[PDB]
Amino acid sequence: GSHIEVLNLVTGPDSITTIELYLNTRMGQNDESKDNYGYSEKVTVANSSDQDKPTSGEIPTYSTARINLPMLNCNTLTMWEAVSVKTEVVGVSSLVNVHMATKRMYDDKGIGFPVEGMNFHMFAVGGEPLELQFLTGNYRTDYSANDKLVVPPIKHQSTQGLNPHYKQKLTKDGAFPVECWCPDPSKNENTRYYGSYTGGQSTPPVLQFTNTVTTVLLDENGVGPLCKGDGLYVSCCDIVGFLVGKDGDMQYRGLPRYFNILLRKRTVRN
Amino acid sequence: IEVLNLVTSITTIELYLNTRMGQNDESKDNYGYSEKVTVANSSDQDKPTSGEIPTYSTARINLPMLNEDLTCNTLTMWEAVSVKTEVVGVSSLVNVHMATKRMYDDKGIGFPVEGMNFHMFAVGGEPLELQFLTGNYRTDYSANDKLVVPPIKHQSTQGLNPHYKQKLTKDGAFPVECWCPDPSKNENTRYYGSYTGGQSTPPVLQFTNTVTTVLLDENGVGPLCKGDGLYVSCCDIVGFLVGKDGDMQYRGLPRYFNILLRKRTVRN
Amino acid sequence: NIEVLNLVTGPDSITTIELYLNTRMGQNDESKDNYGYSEKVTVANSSDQDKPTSGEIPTYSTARINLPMLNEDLTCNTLTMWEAVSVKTEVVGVSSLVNVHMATKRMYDDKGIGFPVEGMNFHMFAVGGEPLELQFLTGNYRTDYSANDKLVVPPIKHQSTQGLNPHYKQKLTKDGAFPVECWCPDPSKNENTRYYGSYTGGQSTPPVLQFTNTVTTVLLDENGVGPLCKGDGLYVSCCDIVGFLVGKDGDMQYRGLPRYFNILLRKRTVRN
Amino acid sequence: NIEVLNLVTGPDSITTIELYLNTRMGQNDESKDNYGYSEKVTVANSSDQDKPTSGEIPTYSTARINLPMLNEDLTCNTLTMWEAVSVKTEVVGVSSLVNVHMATKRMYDDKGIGFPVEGMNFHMFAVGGEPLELQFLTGNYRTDYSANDKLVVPPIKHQSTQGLNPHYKQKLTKDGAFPVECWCPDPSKNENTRYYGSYTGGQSTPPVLQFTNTVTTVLLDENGVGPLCKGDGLYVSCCDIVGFLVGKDGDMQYRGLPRYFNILLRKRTVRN
Amino acid sequence: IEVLNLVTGPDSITTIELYLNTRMGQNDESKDNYGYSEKVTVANSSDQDKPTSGEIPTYSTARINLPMLNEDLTCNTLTMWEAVSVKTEVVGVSSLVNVHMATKRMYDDKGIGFPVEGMNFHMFAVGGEPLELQFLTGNYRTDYSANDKLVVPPIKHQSTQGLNPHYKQKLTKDGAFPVECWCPDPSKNENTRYYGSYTGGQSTPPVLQFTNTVTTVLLDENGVGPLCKGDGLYVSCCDIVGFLVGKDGDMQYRGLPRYFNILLRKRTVRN
Numbered sequence A: 001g002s003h004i005e006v007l008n009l010v011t012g013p014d015s016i017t018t019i020e021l022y023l024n025t026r027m028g029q030n031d032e033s034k035d036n037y038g039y040s041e042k043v044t045v046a047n048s049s050d051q052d053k054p055t056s057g058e059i060p061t062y063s064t065a066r067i068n069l070p071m072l073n074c075n076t077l078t079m080w081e082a083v084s085v086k087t088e089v090v091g092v093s094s095l096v097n098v099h100m101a102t103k104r105m106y107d108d109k110g111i112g113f114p115v116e117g118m119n120f121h122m123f124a125v126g127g128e129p130l131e132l133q134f135l136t137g138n139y140r141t142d143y144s145a146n147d148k149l150v151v152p153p154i155k156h157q158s159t160q161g162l163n164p165h166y167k168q169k170l171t172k173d174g175a176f177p178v179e180c181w182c183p184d185p186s187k188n189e190n191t192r193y194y195g196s197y198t199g200g201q202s203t204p205p206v207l208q209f210t211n212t213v214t215t216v217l218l219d220e221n222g223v224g225p226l227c228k229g230d231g232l233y234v235s236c237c238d239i240v241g242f243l244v245g246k247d248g249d250m251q252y253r254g255l256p257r258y259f260n261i262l263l264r265k266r267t268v269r270n
Numbered sequence B: 001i002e003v004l005n006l007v008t009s010i011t012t013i014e015l016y017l018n019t020r021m022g023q024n025d026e027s028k029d030n031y032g033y034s035e036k037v038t039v040a041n042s043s044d045q046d047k048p049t050s051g052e053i054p055t056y057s058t059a060r061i062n063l064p065m066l067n068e069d070l071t072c073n074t075l076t077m078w079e080a081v082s083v084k085t086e087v088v089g090v091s092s093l094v095n096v097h098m099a100t101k102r103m104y105d106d107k108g109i110g111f112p113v114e115g116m117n118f119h120m121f122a123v124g125g126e127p128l129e130l131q132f133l134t135g136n137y138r139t140d141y142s143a144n145d146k147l148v149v150p151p152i153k154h155q156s157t158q159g160l161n162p163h164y165k166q167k168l169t170k171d172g173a174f175p176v177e178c179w180c181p182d183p184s185k186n187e188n189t190r191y192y193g194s195y196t197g198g199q200s201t202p203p204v205l206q207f208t209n210t211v212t213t214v215l216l217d218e219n220g221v222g223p224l225c226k227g228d229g230l231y232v233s234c235c236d237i238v239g240f241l242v243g244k245d246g247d248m249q250y251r252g253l254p255r256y257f258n259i260l261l262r263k264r265t266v267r268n
Numbered sequence C, D: 001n002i003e004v005l006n007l008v009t010g011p012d013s014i015t016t017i018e019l020y021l022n023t024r025m026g027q028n029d030e031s032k033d034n035y036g037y038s039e040k041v042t043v044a045n046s047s048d049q050d051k052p053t054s055g056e057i058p059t060y061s062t063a064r065i066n067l068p069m070l071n072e073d074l075t076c077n078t079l080t081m082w083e084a085v086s087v088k089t090e091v092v093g094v095s096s097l098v099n100v101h102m103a104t105k106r107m108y109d110d111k112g113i114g115f116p117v118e119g120m121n122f123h124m125f126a127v128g129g130e131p132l133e134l135q136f137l138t139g140n141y142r143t144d145y146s147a148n149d150k151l152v153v154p155p156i157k158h159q160s161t162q163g164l165n166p167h168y169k170q171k172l173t174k175d176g177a178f179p180v181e182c183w184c185p186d187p188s189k190n191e192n193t194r195y196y197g198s199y200t201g202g203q204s205t206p207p208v209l210q211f212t213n214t215v216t217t218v219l220l221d222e223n224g225v226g227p228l229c230k231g232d233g234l235y236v237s238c239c240d241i242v243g244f245l246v247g248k249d250g251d252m253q254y255r256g257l258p259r260y261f262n263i264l265l266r267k268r269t270v271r272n
Numbered sequence E: 001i002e003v004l005n006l007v008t009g010p011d012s013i014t015t016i017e018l019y020l021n022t023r024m025g026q027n028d029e030s031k032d033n034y035g036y037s038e039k040v041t042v043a044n045s046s047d048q049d050k051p052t053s054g055e056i057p058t059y060s061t062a063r064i065n066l067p068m069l070n071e072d073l074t075c076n077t078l079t080m081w082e083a084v085s086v087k088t089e090v091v092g093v094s095s096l097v098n099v100h101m102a103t104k105r106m107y108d109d110k111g112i113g114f115p116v117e118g119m120n121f122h123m124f125a126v127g128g129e130p131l132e133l134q135f136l137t138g139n140y141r142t143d144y145s146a147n148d149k150l151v152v153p154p155i156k157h158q159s160t161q162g163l164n165p166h167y168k169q170k171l172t173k174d175g176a177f178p179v180e181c182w183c184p185d186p187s188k189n190e191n192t193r194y195y196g197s198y199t200g201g202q203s204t205p206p207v208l209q210f211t212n213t214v215t216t217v218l219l220d221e222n223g224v225g226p227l228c229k230g231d232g233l234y235v236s237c238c239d240i241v242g243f244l245v246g247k248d249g250d251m252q253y254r255g256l257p258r259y260f261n262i263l264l265r266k267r268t269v270r271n
């Protein structure tokens, strides 16, 4: 029904390190050598809810990585503590393109449709894998066209709400569908996550990019994510809209995300 | 309640509430949605079908029973200090392959869940106090006798008539469309709500585990839990699912709560 | 104006006033159908034949509240007045807009939802120590209000009233009588009132509304002085249009919601 | 460059100026029909035949206000100037946009509301101690303004004026005469003026407007110095376009609203 | 660069003022359509995506010479100009209050001409060296050979539809680097501050502000601003305010100029 012991900071030289990385988008065609890279395959639409079987590659998934940190280690131990992150979406300016082979405005005389519609942006930084809760708009969705997707082995009506028997951890890049996995708010004590969704059909994307913003990862007690086994975990998804082909066929478009994470040495009980 | 000193003594309570859009049985199809919306032919024959009406989610939590010294003139109560609350499953709206109407002459995406959004939560030391107010005084709720609605109707209930009140004491039973928070009461509850209307309006939603909502009032006093009960209420409508033929259903999402409480001494 | 002196201290120096105002959208009789809405909107054939029907015009809501009497003697060197310090105010019944089964026009070839109340939003409130002072300004100087002689409008019309003509003023002294479309707060007066307003227009625009019991609006001015209640009267005014209800055949009515107020006042000494 | 010294204190060291400016949308004669609107908008057949009709072009509103005389000996090493410290400004008549019964196009097969005034919004104001300095910049260098010889525009046309050509400048010295479409604030000058503006475009966009008497805008710069009023003149300028009125047959006109100002000034000593 | 103390006293501060005109595609100030692109064209297929010359917006940029600081470049410390703050505005916003140009129009040829509307893209950067760029495109197959004055990579690969760090550049030429395929490199630009926004969609209302009252601080979290290498200050921007829709539905980008007023101070550094 209703429901690590942190000591002092280590000071002096080499008590701080920074980790820098980017994650490329996982919209469905996730192979950097292939023509549709950075987009999904063409979206298809189920005839009925009990025949909802998306094609292989039409499904966005989370991006994720584990980064090795310098090895630190007794009655106490030292852990890396994530203090802050500077993060930005890369390639926003690529959306200033209206000459691609797309549907166009004004009786074939106007601009090509820009990438537009649904936006979904999330990132997470933690000291262990992001903990996931299963929740879907259709419990009957059949993911069997792509056995590389990680989804529950059984299906039940209750998964259109919150059924806590259906959980996971984000342990693989380009494998956990966004549409059915979300952060588990009853866990993730050692991760910070931030997300937004703007829906609708052809909604204008609203995006910003700057190298001047720092996000503090410390909690209300002044403690950041503590990196278990000297691993830092970073996850994200950045859907910026749909590309609309000549005939009306549509694909998700995603952009990469950059991270610069500041960490510090923290002594902990052992 | 005359509030005295803090006891120096803390606890947290964690829970979620599932949405009550109308199909509220977790074992059946369409859980977390309403039944198909229907439309009255006239205002004097406005009788929603059973299960097409969203209602408030709510629960009462039994807190740890505090020692009380009835021989003395003070008592200890739990005081709700703050809450971290989030809508769960927002990413589930990133789905345009469901059996829905679709864009661009049957070649484009399925329509995502879109349209009206309604988001509210409340945390208090007693049931959320409600005021009746409706868009149509004549609405007939008799297709579902489990709904809690007034026993009589009157034209004046399209505005504020203070003779029509209730308390949110049952989950999945009080229609959002005719009950709102009573701003003349709720001295011992904090509530927060928003509505964004229109037909096919983009949902705009956020989720994070980093935001704390302070529940202390202007005197530094949080909700005080009468009889060791903590009351949590919400509703989170994120839009409508548009079926192939244009039939529509409300879609709602669950809400998570993590409430911090402390012991407070009060006059008995 | 009033010469403001020190605050009065002690255990009787504060009071609070709580009230609500029901909306005045046009059908303002609580015993009748369509309460809280206007009558059906009609459209002029030409600007010189612009005569709204009775009850299709929203008006301001207003009340004067009697405060506890101060000053048993009025011949004194100084007097005491109630000073409004702050207000907690909310729009009531926002959740009532979560209703798409009313007898309305509907989406997707008669299969989808009923249209929710949507379109133009207009929200304002005022708290003062005397009636809200008003300036006339209209979109059409020729508008003929004679279908309803209970509306308070100027007795003469002139072209210049489509801009600001300071010869056309009034005070908000009657509930449900001053049309919103032709009367606005007079920004050259209202020294003893605080007012706040917003407008979001367009045809079928989503209403965007909030409600909470946690927000206090401070009424003190830049000198730390709130509205001072002349004759021990507190004046509260508002209007809250949340959109239009679209009937089956396309006919439309304004929809308004009530507003709640909880006002904190304190005793202030003034020169007499 | 004026060298600022100390503030002058004591009685009579502060003054206030209150005024309003009526809108200059194109029909700018308060005695005539359509005051506060433009004439109907016309559309060029080609960029080399872009000759707007007289009265279809919004212009800036502006006034020079004579301040109280600062009488003093002019031969000494200091002088006194009025310094504008802050302004409270509001758009007047926002509630007038709550009107959907005017002779307009209407919604839902001639059954619904008249279209409210909607679309493009442009709001700007400026307070300074000399005229607002202007930069010419246009969307079409060939625009022919000769239908109305009272408009102030450059005497020559050149392709480069579709960007910033610093040889094309002016000063806002006349009300209802400088078109908004081709004159903007010069950001390389205006050291002695503060200006603030916003534009929201699109075709039928909802106007989003606020009004309150509770907001003060500080005019002091980063060094604590406000506009200094040369020759005891205070310059106020604005434009407030709130959208278009859509007539029965689809003909459209700009609609503007007046703006109110309350400006606080103080005496400042300057080097002579 | 090892940053030491501020230089104080008379002449320790200077200001730079400039504007940059927009580079939408027709970038010749003596010709018609200046400040706009040429007419937008649409590829028939992905492998025939070859924009016409002049239809492609590029970044504006300039390097400004600052007062010379070091007569002897072999001293054990040197002085550099440090950019502290910038006041920047988009110029000519009021020019968008124009609905009588030769455009498509509303309401069955009776209403207003369409105003410039749709996609907005706004960015500026101030730094002590050229803005560092990362290549990223919506279509690796885009053929820029209709205009060999555009600076783009000679070899393009599918991986350029995401972030491939092998594809970088520096913004060293005005009116030459297309916005559609070059963005700031977030893994570099340690000595530049950049700010950008994009609002997309088809006919979206432009939402724009202008004022002379806002100062943007360029100091980083350590209190250090961009340090001007070789006494050069680098300013870059792009301000797309939408499209002009011609009578027949043909569309062109419209851009506006941007003004900058930059305050700089003398900073000692190790040499």
Ligand SMILES: CC(=O)N[C@H]1[C@H]([C@H](O)[C@H](O)CO)O[C@@](O)(C(=O)O)C[C@@H]1O
Binding pocket: B037, B038, B039, B040, B041, B045, B046, B047, B048, B049, C101, C102
């Ligand atoms: C709100 C309302 O009154 N709905 C009524 C509906 C609608 O008028 C039509 O279905 C059109 O949607 O008709 C019913 O026969 C039905 O379908 O069950 C009765 C129901 O009470």
Ligand SMILES: CC(=O)N[C@H]1[C@H]([C@H](O)[C@H](O)CO)O[C@@](O)(C(=O)O)C[C@@H]1O
Binding pocket: C041, C042, C043, C044, C045, C049, C050, C051, C052, C053, D101, D102
């Ligand atoms: C604003 C206005 O002038 N309304 C007038 C209307 C409208 O012109 C039409 O009904 C079209 O809606 O016509 C009336 O005969 C009516 O219906 O009562 C008189 C009324 O004065």
